[PDB]
């Protein structure tokens with residue numbers, strides 16, 4: 001049993017501010033701590049080694065520090081590119097061990113979603129099933145509510161949605177929702193609509209289309 | 214330039230084994246350790262071990278004895294990790310990594326990871342459907358279009374646009390798990406509406422476990 005612990009699981013900061021994550025070490029490790037940055041779907045990238053200085057090409061925003069058992073990664077002048085999960089690691093003694101990870105969240109101004117809707121393709125309909133997609137593009141904050149209405153009847157139980165990670169350039173989110181019906185049920189109804197509520201919208205936004213176009 | 218290229222995604226029966234590979238290039242393979250790391254989103258990062266390709270020596274994390282076995286082929290500058298006795302709890306992304314230190318300046322390099330899904334279910338390749346641009350997917354002269362990558366198992370699919378030439382404005386969403394146990398995924402991109410008649414938009418979907426490759430052209434309607 002040897003462990004490294006980061007107290008903050010989530011950290012929140014604005015662009016241009018300084019932030020720092022704490023990593024505590026169970027035993028004396030001295031210089032031999034490393035720090036990593038990871039973005040979703042990507043490999044980790046090392047930021048700091050010797051607990052105190054930075055890998056080639058890492059910018060000066062990142063300063064590591066610590067003595068023996070208490071370590072901090074500090075990020076000055078935080079950028080939207082800095083949105084990532086951050087890990088400490090000890091390489092002093094085996095087995096090598098990482099911390100639990102600290103996710104950086106970027107606070108920014110409210111941004112309303114651009115709302116788009118896609119009818120099913122003819123190729124999918126030939127397979128006997130119909131998917132309608134509702135896309136909410138680049139919005140903030142993350143909280144958004146999507147309601148599917150078919151012939152103005154509120155649907156439930158027949159849809160699924162997913163939200164992106166926070167964007168590395170504009171710190172927004174995007175959300176995709178799919179309403180999935182059989183071809184037979186799809187043809188029983190005329191109007192397909194998704195209704196979006198979001199803090200940036202003074203009133204709900206509805207995108208809709210008539211089946212048969 | 215240094216590159217670590219890892220093998221494709223895997224589906225493996227419980228209790229069975231699979232060999233992951235990590236092909237190195239751009240440097241003297243025999244002069245630096247290859248390190249291997251496991252990442253499970255439900256637990257975090259774990260170091261598996263290192264192997265030195267010059268003499269084949271290894272240092273394993275005690276927890277992976279009998280689960281992992283590291284080897285290298287210096288002839289092809291390739292490192293390998295044999296995974297065996299996998300439980301359904303062992304599904305993970307596995308990374309290989311190496312570090313070059315010169316005059317105590319250090320630079321790390323990582324493979325892109327290999328997803329290993331441990332399950333008894335059979336693999337299924339995706340159906341790929343266009344999300345056509347239309348008046349209902351336009352805003353301020355931009356047009357949204359996409360692909361719906363539906364009914365596949367296991368994760369992951371890799372989706373690209375125009376063989377990688379199109380990356381700005383792409384959102385490839387996290388997949389959702391359907392009642393059937395199959396996954397579905399959306400990939401969308403925003404482009405100028407003015408140029409819809411002259412540009413071609415093709416989503417390239419690849420799913421290694423079923424050896425499925427689809428290039429789907431997305432046309433307005």
Ligand SMILES: CCC(=O)N(c1ccccc1)C1CCN(CCc2ccccc2)CC1
Pocket residue numbers: 034046049050089090091096248260310311312314317318319321322
């Ligand atoms: C779990 C993997 C791991 O622990 N590492 C790693 C990371 C990426 C790829 C390969 C291995 C360590 C990264 C830090 N280096 C520090 C070396 C050093 C110390 C003092 C001065 C100059 C250089 C040691 C290996």
